[PDB]
Structure formats: structure tokens, C-alpha cells
Amino acid sequence: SKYGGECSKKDNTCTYRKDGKDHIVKCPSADNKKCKTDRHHCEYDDHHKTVDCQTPV
Numbered sequence: 001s002k003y004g005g006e007c008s009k010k011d012n013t014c015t016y017r018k019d020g021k022d023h024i025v026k027c028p029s030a031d032n033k034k035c036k037t038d039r040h041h042c043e044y045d046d047h048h049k050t051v052d053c054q055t056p057v
């Protein structure tokens with residue numbers, strides 16, 4: 001599945017909720033996937049094993 005959360009601009013991480021716990025994973029350093037805006041929605045995609053801290057709004 002895909003798991004949603006919020007990104008930290010300070011740390012360039014995504015904190016996502018999965019099975020009742022929070023998990024923190026680095027965002028990519030790629031320009032249009034990194035955490036550009038603090039607390040932007042982010043997702044960990046467990047099908048692709050990928051993270052995006054600029055999920056489509």
C-alpha cells in the first residue's frame with residue numbers, strides 16, 4: 001500500500017503512519033520530491049519502495 005504523512009523541511013524526512021505506528025524515512029534529494037515546504041503531505045509507497053515529499057495536491 002501507500003502510507004501518508006507529513007514531511008520535515010529541516011530534516012528532509014517523511015513521517016508516515018503504518019499499522020498504528022509512525023515511521024520516519026528520508027525524502028529523496030531530488031528537486032521535485034524533497035521536502036520543500038515544512039509539513040507538506042508525503043507518502044511512502046510500499047509497492048514501489050519509494051518516497052515522495054511533494055505528493056500531488
Ligand SMILES: [Cl-]
Nearest residue numbers: 020021022023
Ligand atoms: Cl509509534
Ligand SMILES: [Cl-]
Nearest residue numbers: 009036037038
Ligand atoms: Cl516551509
